[PDB]
Design a protein around this nucleic acid. Sequence first.
DNA 1: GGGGTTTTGAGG
DNA 2: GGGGTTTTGGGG
DNA 3: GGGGTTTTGGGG
Lengths: 216, 460
Amino acid sequence: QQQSAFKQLYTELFNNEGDFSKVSSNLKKPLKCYVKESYPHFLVTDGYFFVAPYFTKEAVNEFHAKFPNVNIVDLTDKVIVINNWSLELRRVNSAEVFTSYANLEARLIVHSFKPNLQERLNPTRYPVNLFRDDEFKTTIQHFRHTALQAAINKTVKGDNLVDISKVADAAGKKGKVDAGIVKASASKGDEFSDFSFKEGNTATLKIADIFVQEKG
Amino acid sequence: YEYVELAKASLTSAQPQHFYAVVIDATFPYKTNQERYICSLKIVDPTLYLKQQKGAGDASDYATLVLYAKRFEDLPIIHRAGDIIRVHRATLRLYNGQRQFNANVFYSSSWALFSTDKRSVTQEINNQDAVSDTTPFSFSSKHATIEKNEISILQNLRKWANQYFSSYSVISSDMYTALNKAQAQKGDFDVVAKILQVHELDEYTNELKLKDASGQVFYTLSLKLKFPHVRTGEVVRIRSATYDETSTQKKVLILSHYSNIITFIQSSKLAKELRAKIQDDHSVEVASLKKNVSLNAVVLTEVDKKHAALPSTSLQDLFHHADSDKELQAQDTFRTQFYVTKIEPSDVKEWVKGYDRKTKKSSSLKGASGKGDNIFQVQFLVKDASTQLNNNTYRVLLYTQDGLGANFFNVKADNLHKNADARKKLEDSAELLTKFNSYVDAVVERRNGFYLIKDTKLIY
DNA sequence: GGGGTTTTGAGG
DNA sequence: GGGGTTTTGGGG
DNA sequence: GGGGTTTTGGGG
Ligand SMILES: [Cl-]
Ligand code: NA
Ligand code: NA
Ligand code: NA
Ligand code: NA
């Protein structure tokens, strides 16, 4: 039994080809999470790991409406309750996004969240980046291994085996190693990208804009 | 400078004092706030190293050293227990019963590290020789001076350190927690275990397979750049770990930015006994092979003993730099780890062809013996950590006509169209090789632009 | 000090 | 000059 | 006081 709500949710998302409708329904309930940081990065925890929530322009306007005396960029060490949320996979540059791995990211799309101002939460272990967790990374790698292996078995065909005479009697034979390189898929670039999940799309606000919207 | 022994340093002077000591434990240097870094270590010497033995339990006694700095680069990185440290201008005080030396490196304090073994950890990793036995391999500030009179102190301390580590455990039982009782700890705890496997999870992270004396196996993540000294078969002491309640598939230890992985000097009695007592475990691997999806990595092969000391080369270097790098061009034999994405030919039955040594041609045995000597002509399409994100899969050959990799499958070549037993064993190997989290550790020899597997055998 | 950063959020 | 430190204004 | 530095006698 997975004690981390986030770990479980994101794991099922990946084990279900990024399809949020296939993830257990008994997991799409309101999320009460502790705010670890709010600026420059807004990170919330579930008691075990931290994740970065992506707020829609609608969600923030609704927030500022129901809670005029509350600035989001100042919710650090405070608790929030996300009543309406969704998850989706996105291709990113893990070299720049630390809340991602292997150029993949599972995003927590926030549509509506209430700030339970001054609610003291129970003591927990130090929160760790979910995209740095051994099992979770391995779950992502499983995801790509399945994508890759399917792509390869569709791309490579005909059994173009190196002629045995090339590796036999190779006394006066020289060759370039790159001759062993085989394209994995019909991808356009030098990066593998032949995945079946349909990359979710949804406009989200940059934590910097919400900072200016509350203090130019 | 006048050097004083740990047990004889004044607790009332409050004046800066200097000493040489042996480091038996330390945290990695870590950042506390926007302007401070700390490194806490435990030190011993001829006058302070063991508690009143009678009812003590041969427990190690020690002073503590806390070094403070404004920059990371200004604090010592202790990769190995047993080396020596020289400190200047430290103030001593009693902290909860024990002698605590404090030194603000950001002000007027300094340290210097000296190797107790021939080479320092970094030097052994790079296969370098030490300038001299009186040269510090690391130190604070821009300069370090060793006076003629110190040479005796340093030589004697080294002599003592070896006597100490070969005679006592140094890291006593009270200094760590048995892995099989790891889930009972409230917070963090130390470990002393043998490194059974170093799996390259990705471009920046190693996943260590630990086993300690209690026989429990745990995994933990080690950043390559932080702990470059991790090596299979070696015994380390892990400073500060915590049990992961969210890992359900495997037992995992979490480390922190201040945690540290520490090796022992050559004379260590504890490291010697553990390297022999703790034996490899494959229970985790065997169990995982029964599951459709294993979050535990499984190394399916073992290379001949004569190669166990050969350094590994990534596919990245083997296929993209082996024709442009001076060092890579000079070698014809290499060692490498990878996972198999596809195996050709598709029909396992054609893995074995008949070979004609005169015409150098192979053929299907579906027609039978009329093709010559039986041999394996298998083409593996593989990938690895260094080539994870690219759109390539690389070819690795198992062409045994000349003896290379003949016993890779532990199944002598044979007409797989007639020998059911052979075919079945190979078919099963096939599913294992292509299964997620299955990897191959192998030695390859470059021949006419291709790499053939040799001196490598499946151990499952 | 047996500890909690970040232009470093993949040494810190 | 400016830190850390305590010398709390002045050495070399 | 004493570093490293240049301020080369004096701030905080
Ligand atoms: Cl060649
Ligand atoms: Na002063
Ligand atoms: Na001064
Ligand atoms: Na001065
Ligand atoms: Na001066």
